[PDB]
Amino acid sequence: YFNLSGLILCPVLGSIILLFIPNSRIRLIRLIGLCASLITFLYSLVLWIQFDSSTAKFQFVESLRWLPYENINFYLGIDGISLFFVILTTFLIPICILVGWSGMRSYGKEYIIAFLICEFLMIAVFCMLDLLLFYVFFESVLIPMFIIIGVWGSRQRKIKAAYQFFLYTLLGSLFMLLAILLILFQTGTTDLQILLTTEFSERRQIFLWIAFFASFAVKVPMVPVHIWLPEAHVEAPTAGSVIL
Amino acid sequence: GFIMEFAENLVLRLMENPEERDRKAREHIYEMHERCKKIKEMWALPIRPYGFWTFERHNAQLRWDPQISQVAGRRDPYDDLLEDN
């Protein structure tokens, strides 16, 4: 019985174990990182087989209370849409470890730690059903990718790429957060199933939808803000350029 | 036997009860909406309760002064005059 939580925990265990060992034994670090990524990939494939495509309700749900009132909590869960994204994000990470396999002695253990943290965080984003906490993990990828781009990037313009990438995900992100708070105060919970079955005011949906689109028009390269992707993507490492 | 005759029922054991899933989904929706209404009611409480001073902890003087109104420095002038008899 393989649940959704073990998939999330596997990169966490791989990262915690990797910090215990020192940096002198570089072969152990790369071997353990690749092994953790590959077992996470296999676990993701196993989750595919035991996926009911007939029902419309969500698959494995793990609820961990967050607020004392159980008002909002980690509500994990996959469906037809979120499953393939989980499989893809589990599949891409071992490739990321493998591309820079020769230069691992130059990068160090921070590189694999950052990539496994990214895998954990990206898995947590796709397979969760809490609107607010999904926002938390949605821009939680700022720190690890900022580190990846900045520490191992271009020659001298690496600083500017990090700043443009970090700046484009602030104003729209928090303008989305305002809508998140209005939704939370209006309805009462951020559970996705509850929020789907709610009568929103006709004039209210326009503002909330605009706020949501403002923070998604930056991640999806829309017309106003898409110049970050070329510059911040050329000024990025090859393994950081394959998940971006 | 052969591989598929075992992999079949292996996958069938791996998969879960959908009736349990549907029941849990409708349940979770029911209690989540009830708790949502409860929290909406709770957020409506004013910062200052209607009673406030009526509360026994917010008086602290109606049951302290009566046992002090006999000490020197707090007596009505017409208390020591007729207390002799």
Six-digit token pair at B56? 């026994």
Looking at chain A, which runs of residues are DSSP E strands? 63-65, 73-75
Distance CA A176, CA A124 (A): 19
Question: Which of these, A79, A25, A86, lies nearest to A56 by C-alpha position?
Answer: A79
The whole-angstrom distance between A212's CA and the closest CA on chain B is: 23
Residues of A44-77 as b/e, b for ≥16 C-beta within 10 angstroms?
Answer: beebeebeeeeeebbbbbbeeebeeeebbbbbbb
Candidates B10, B15, B17, B28: best to mutate against A (most CBs of A within 10 A) is B28
Distance CA A220, CA B55 (A): 57
- CA A161-A162-A167 angle, to 5 degrees, is 100
How far the first Cα of chain A sits from its last, in Å, is 33
A20 CB within 8 Å of a chain B CB: no
Cβ distance B25 to A57 less than 8 Å, yes or no, reads yes
Of A50, A58, A189, the CB nearest to B36: A189
Determination technique for this entry = cryo-EM
Six-digit token pair at A38? 């590959």
Q: What Å distances lie between residue A27 and A10, A101, A107, A149, B48, CA to CA?
A: 20, 10, 13, 24, 64
Query: Pseudo-torsion of CA B4, B7, B8, B14, nearest 10°?
Result: -170
Cβ distance B14 to A49 less than 8 Å, yes or no, reads yes
Six-digit token pair at A21? 């060992």
CB A43 within 8 A of CB A6: yes
Distance CA A189, CA A199 (A): 14
Distance CA A124, CA A133 (A): 10
Of A49, A55, A61, the CB nearest to B18: A55
Six-digit token pair at B38? 């409860």
Cβ distance B21 to A187 less than 8 Å, yes or no, reads no
